[PDB]
Design a protein around this ligand. Structure first.
Ligand SMILES: O=C1N=NC(=O)c2cc(OCC3CCCC3)ccc21
Lengths: 197, 196
């Protein structure tokens, strides 16, 4: 497990509240406020999930071997409802639970480049106390292409070799604003931002 | 950390290895099939050596062994499929998003008996009459009865909604099938090519 994590004392899961003024808090706040300056952060929690981390790190090493470069990982946003937060914290992102996107590039889990997109009430639905929830997520975007609404996996790179797949898809390869991933353990929920108007 | 019985792959990460008829391994797998499918004709048995699928599976097995505090979480089951799905399963394993009836939930189905997987609706005969069935290592873990429309196994106690059963079945006392809902809970270990 990463050496900067808090000691969980044999436990496999912990949410750690970050302190404003620490570099770790400030980098996430700045990434958020770059496009969400009209909202205010209540708190930022580091997600320490040993099993999700292990499974994600195995997929990352595999993708780093296959693609024969790094640059497979992006830090993206995912807005969700309060009812989903316990499941995501413990089990991560499940495509079987994903809603249809208003612009669909495939049947998978969606991640935004900009916090403003994830901050829409459609995604980060305000709870009964007006709190909105957004994850900051390590996503294995790898090698990507423009998606299509019918996809249940990324498309093949070559139609004559249908099993050799792109890693993810996007809305626009030249100016990506979202990514869709179709497999478990391709996304690690790293931070949970709780925020309000 | 690849199994001793795998054959050398000359520094590659994926190989389908045809088994030698009459040796220990071929005999063991053939016997599991002929237990219930002795009226079929076996063309060949192939060992699936997929390093990445194996790594991902072994990590989930180690996690399930810790979570359940025992090492009885794995079963050897059967899965019939059509010829056009075989290259995908060999490379990528099983995908619940590529669904036949799903009465016990929206997962991947595995049969206890090869005879069940040998039905033409599962192991669809190709243009040459050939049928395809995997012998699969499945992390069934702690299981409960399934039902239509599950996207994950149910919780073990509704007081902790995120502490789930590992798999579901048709019948907890005498199971004939299992359903798993997560990638890398099943490792396709052998592919049997056969005819009626
Ligand atoms: O071998 C199989 N390959 N693909 C399947 O979908 C499958 C499904 C299966 O049980 C399906 C249930 C039986 C009663 C209602 C639903 C058993 C085996 C296989």
């Amino acid at each position: 497990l990463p050496e900067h994590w808090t000691d969980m004392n044999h436990q496999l899961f912990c949410m750690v509240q970050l302190e404003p003024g620490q570099s770790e808090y400030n980098t996430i706040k700045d990434k958020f406020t770059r496009t969400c300056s009209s909202y205010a952060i209540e708190k930022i929690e580091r997600i320490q999930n040993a099993f999700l981390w292990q499974s994600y790190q195995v997929k990352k090493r595999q993708m780093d071997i296959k693609n024969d470069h790094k640059n497979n990982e992006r830090l993206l946003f995912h807005g969700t409802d309060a009812d989903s937060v316990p499941y995501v914290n413990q089990h991560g992102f499940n495509r079987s639970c994903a809603g249809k996107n208003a612009v669909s590039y495939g049947k998978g889990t969606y991640f935004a480049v900009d916090a403003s997109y994830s901050a829409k009430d459609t995604y980060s639905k305000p709870d009964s106390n007006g709190r909105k929830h957004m994850y900051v997520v390590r996503v294995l975007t790898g090698v990507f292409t423009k998606g299509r609404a019918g996809l249940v996996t990324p498309p093949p790179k070559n139609p004559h070799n249908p099993t050799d797949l792109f890693d993810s898809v996007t809305n626009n390869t030249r100016s990506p604003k979202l990514f869709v991933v179709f497999f478990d353990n391709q996304a690690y929920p790293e931070y949970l931002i709780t925020f309000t108007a």
